Inverse folding.
């Protein structure tokens, strides 16, 4: 049954789970051609597969060669996504295989179910949450590794850096979704907040700055301010009147 804010806590139990986001798999850029026309040109994409409990991000880079001279592309993209997720799962020992895979887009449900027939004990589920994982390509280190790729490959990161030494999975996931939601809402302002010191640095093996515990509280309130103020412009409501469960709903995407 679909994952929503009323049952999403399940993400942090002992049943290994993965989110799969396919929104960055098929990507184009617009460019000027040698005759002076304008055209689209495919660029590398990625499948974003995340364990929200451990932070492990399996970033499968989709090379443009996959698309070359191919028909029915939206069909292929989903097939490609399903193929790769199933191949990852199939490479893991049984004890590392997820119990559930949660797709961020309902369109991914059937293709993944078809490709996961070999895994009867793995539940494929849709979600009501409109999670901001599309904003993964706004994290500079992720964006660069994708763009520099010259062949298919998978790269693994901990998208929580070292946070789990200090905070719970529930807290880390809340922080991540807040950061991604803010990046999705206003990339430029979100990065300005992140670089506000800007002496607080990003370790070479990390995605985010090395903020202290109290510093993260502040960054998080600013990220929250960025999001809510924009929501307020759109809908004409008093931010401060919003309940806790209303604010979460906004961040998570319902």
């Amino acid at each position: 049954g679909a994952m929503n804010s009323s049952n999403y806590a399940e993400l942090f139990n002992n049943d290994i789970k993965l989110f799969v986001d396919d929104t960055n798999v098929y990507r184009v850029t617009v460019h000027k051609t040698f005759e002076g026309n304008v055209a689209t040109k495919a660029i590398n994409g990625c499948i974003f597969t995340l364990n929200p409990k451990t932070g492990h991000l399996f970033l499968k880079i989709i090379h443009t060669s996959v698309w070359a001279g191919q028909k029915r592309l939206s069909q292929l993209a989903k097939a490609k996504t399903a193929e790769e997720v199933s191949a990852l799962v199939r490479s893991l020992p049984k004890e590392e295989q997820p119990k559930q895979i949660i797709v961020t887009r309902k369109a991914m449900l059937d293709p993944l179910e078809v490709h996961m027939l070999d895994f009867p004990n793995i539940a494929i589920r849709p979600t009501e949450l409109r999670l901001p994982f599309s904003a993964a390509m706004s994290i500079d280190k992720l964006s660069d590794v994708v763009m520099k790729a010259t062949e298919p490959q998978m790269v693994l990161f901990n998208i929580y850096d070292d946070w789990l030494d200090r905070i719970s999975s529930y807290t880390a996931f809340s922080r991540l979704t807040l950061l991604l939601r803010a990046l999705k809402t206003n990339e430029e302002s979100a990065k300005m907040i992140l670089l506000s010191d800007p002496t607080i640095t990003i370790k070479s093996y990390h995605l985010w700055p090395s903020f202290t515990d109290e510093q993260w509280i502040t960054i998080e309130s600013q990220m929250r301010d960025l999001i809510l103020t924009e929501y307020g412009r759109k809908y004409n409501v008093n931010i401060s009147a919003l309940t806790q469960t209303e604010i979460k709903d906004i961040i998570l995407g319902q």
About this structure: Residues 1-161 form a domain with the Nucleotidyltransferase; domain 5 fold (CATH 3.30.420.230). DSSP finds seven helices and eight strands in the chain.
